[PDB]
């Protein structure tokens, strides 16, 4: 029968690891680096695009940074198509919570839900896991500014600063060196870009290679604004910090 | 070899190895004998024990007032199949007010066993059955194999060393068929037949199991001191 052709995606190795999760993580390690840095007055999301071509229409392009609601955004590392399936599920979960309680979804609850979906693919159903790692940047009135990451295992953890994708070992050492707790958004912007600039496999870091975003409680009259940076705005912040 | 992993695979010579392995479970099972005349039909079964502290595994199951079987192989599979026979006998009674024909009972078992040999996931039944009965066309004896093959016979035997009892019946054919209106002499011939399949062990009081059905005789099982008469 069909048993012959079953890869068995949801089993333990003799060492107690989940084969497909480990191999999905290996896939993610080749994806473009994404960095999240949390400050006292905001969060920065920086990410490197993978496909440098002069003919790629950058201003209408979105492979790394996605919006989940007005308060929460994600940076993607891995298969973009897999990530979009999960993103649309997360967008719906946020609106289901808003419809039910008439309050915006707390960041951790959204993260847990997505992480639980990923977990399900590792324990049952016989399907391959999602080859995606997320950095969640968000705000709510309980914990304020929060950074989380989730990976194909469905495990999630909270961070002050974190990287996913390529060269995370190198990136996490550099963040651990220069990060401080009293840091601000403008300083975190500079740290995020400097870290990518050193870890990048490219010859130089340019505006056409980056997606950039900030979540600030520096909107008019104590609200929270999500800014997805336009190409020209990324070019300006690269000159300002002194990388180009 | 490579073609015995499941029941859905033919070998290159057109054989179904899982069915043949299920057939092997019957040969490991304890011997049971069936035989009949024109008036009565008899089952004789050698029951097997685990050790001296244990009971002897029951070999004979009643299906209706006019029909029942003896088993050899996996007992749980005999329970499944006998329960199916009980229901089919019962359906015939409730819906048609009709005692189920023994030939038709065989046809139903055949078709039930067959479905397990052609579909993936399932396994063949690991048991052989000797069905006796008395219906509107007199006494009957059937042999069921889990390949699906069902055979109407004057006499037969299945299980370990069953070839000895089967040869005896093949010689005795002309004698025991004529034992009409005499249940005790027909049982004697069955007990003498099953004795040809014995080695080392002999027929004791809690070892032997006999059943009979006939013209004015419901299907009744004899165990214990009820079979001491025939030892």
């Amino acid at each position: 029968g069909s048993r012959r052709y079953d890869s068995r995606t949801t089993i333990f190795s003799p060492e107690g690891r989940l084969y497909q999760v480990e191999y999905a993580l290996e896939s993610i390690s080749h994806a473009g680096t994404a960095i999240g840095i949390m400050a006292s007055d905001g969060i920065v999301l920086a990410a490197e695009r993978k496909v440098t071509s002069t003919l790629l229409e950058q201003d209408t392009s979105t492979e790394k940074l996605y919006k989940l609601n007005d308060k929460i955004a994600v940076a993607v590392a891995g298969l973009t198509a897999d990530a979009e399936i999960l993103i649309n599920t997360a967008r719906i979960h946020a609106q289901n919570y808003l419809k039910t309680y008439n309050e915006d979804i707390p960041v951790e609850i959204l993260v847990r839900r997505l992480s639980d979906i990923k977990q399900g693919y590792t324990q049952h159903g016989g399907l391959r896991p999602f080859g995606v790692s997320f950095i969640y940047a968000g705000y709510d009135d309980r914990y304020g500014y929060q950074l989380y990451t989730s990976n194909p295992s469905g495990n999630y953890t909270g961070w002050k600063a974190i990287s996913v994708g390529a060269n995370t070992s190198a990136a996490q050492t550099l963040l651990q060196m220069d990060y401080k707790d009293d840091m601000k958004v403008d300083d975190a912007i500079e740290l995020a870009l400097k870290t990518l600039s050193k870890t990048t496999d490219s010859s130089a870091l340019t505006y056409d290679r980056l997606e950039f975003a900030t979540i600030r409680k520096g909107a008019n009259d104590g609200e929270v604004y999500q800014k997805i940076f336009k190409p020209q705005e990324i070019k300006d912040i690269l000159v300002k910090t002194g990388i180009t | 070899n490579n073609y015995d992993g499941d029941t859905v695979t033919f070998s290159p010579t057109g054989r179904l190895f899982q069915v043949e392995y299920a057939l092997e479970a019957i040969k490991q099972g304890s011997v049971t004998v069936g035989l009949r005349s024109n008036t009565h039909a008899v089952l004789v079964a050698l029951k097997r024990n685990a050790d001296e502290l244990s009971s002897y595994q029951k070999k004979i199951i009643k299906c209706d007032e006019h029909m029942g079987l003896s088993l050899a192989g996996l007992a749980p599979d005999a329970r499944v199949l006998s329960n199916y026979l009980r229901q089919q006998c019962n359906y015939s009674s409730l819906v048609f007010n009709r005692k189920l024909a023994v030939e038709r009972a065989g046809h139903l078992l055949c078709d039930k066993a067959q479905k397990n040999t052609q579909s993936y996931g399932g396994r063949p039944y690991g048991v052989g059955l000797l069905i006796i009965g008395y219906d509107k066309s007199g006494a009957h004896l059937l042999e069921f194999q889990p390949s699906g093959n069902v055979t109407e016979l004057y006499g037969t035997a299945i299980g370990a060393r069953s070839q000895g009892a089967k040869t005896y019946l093949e010689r005795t054919l002309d004698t025991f068929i004529k034992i009409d209106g005499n249940p005790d002499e027909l049982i004697k011939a069955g007990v003498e037949a099953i004795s040809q399949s014995l080695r080392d062990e002999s027929l004791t009081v809690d070892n032997l199991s006999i059943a009979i059905v006939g013209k004015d005789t419901p299907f009744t099982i004899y165990d214990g001191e009820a079979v001491a008469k025939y030892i």
Binding site: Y5, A24, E26, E57, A81, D82 | -
Partner: protein, 250 residues
């Protein structure tokens, strides 16, 4: 008589590769060259009609397909996979959009739906990925003109211009030199014909080339008059004669 393939046939290998997606991309590489170029006032998509026999009527086989009145698609790779994707793309434009909002979907969202269907073939039980890469050109009121590529993985990228299939590496280099942000539609059609001539071996004419545009509204092609807001389809497939005219000024 059971579908017992409830498990993924595309899985991660030790190196992190999804083998079936890579192999689907290899099938796309073998497929005939197709391209797309975006102008200021339009988009052009084009491909070679590789005829399997001269007895076959290549007009009946449409490699360039209308999805909505303002969106068109072309492919490289396995034609049958493309044909069923076009059927599903047309249907999903209605079911998940037009029947809800009373208007056709914008290019990016129709692309997103096609992408979703192709992603599901990359993860669902008992299926292989689609062996095609699509180029989807379209127009909508708020986004303007656009051109998207969609791969077997489900991943999609917006392009100013690109090519896929057989001679895509060479064709992409040719387009990098010629493309600018001030191109008119006629200039893009001219560049499309030049780019496509390099990858074609045999005959090069209107009967062996399939080319369509997303351009101005065509009220003559609408089929009815009396509703001012309905101005006609922006998708138009160029005729065999219309291609040959531009090949003389080539």
């Amino acid at each position: 008589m059971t579908d017992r393939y409830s498990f993924s046939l595309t899985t991660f290998s030790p190196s992190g590769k999804l083998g079936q997606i890579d192999y689907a991309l290899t099938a796309v590489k073998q497929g005939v060259t197709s391209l797309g170029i975006k102008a200021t006032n339009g988009v052009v998509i084009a491909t070679e009609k590789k005829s399997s026999s001269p007895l076959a009527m290549s007009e009946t086989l449409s490699k360039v397909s209308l999805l909505t009145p303002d969106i068109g698609a072309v492919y490289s790779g396995m034609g049958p996979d493309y044909r069923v994707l076009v059927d599903k793309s047309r249907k999903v434009a209605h079911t998940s959009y037009k029947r809800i909002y009373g208007e056709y979907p914008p290019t990016k969202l129709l692309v997103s739906e096609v992408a979703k269907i192709m992603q599901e073939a990359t993860q669902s039980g008992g299926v292989r990925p689609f062996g095609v890469s699509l180029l989807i050109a379209g127009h909508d009121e708020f986004n303007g003109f656009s051109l998207y590529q969609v791969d077997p993985s489900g991943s999609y990228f917006p392009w100013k211009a690109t090519a896929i299939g057989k001679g895509s590496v060479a064709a992409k280099t040719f387009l990098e030199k010629r493309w600018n942000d001030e191109l008119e539609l006629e200039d893009a059609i001219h560049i499309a014909l030049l780019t496509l001539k390099e990858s074609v071996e045999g005959e090069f004419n209107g009967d062996t080339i399939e080319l369509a545009i997303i351009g101005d509204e065509n009220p003559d092609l609408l089929g009815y008059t009396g509703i001012p807001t309905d101005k006609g389809p922006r998708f138009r497939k160029l005729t065999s004669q219309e291609i040959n005219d531009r090949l003389e000024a080539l």
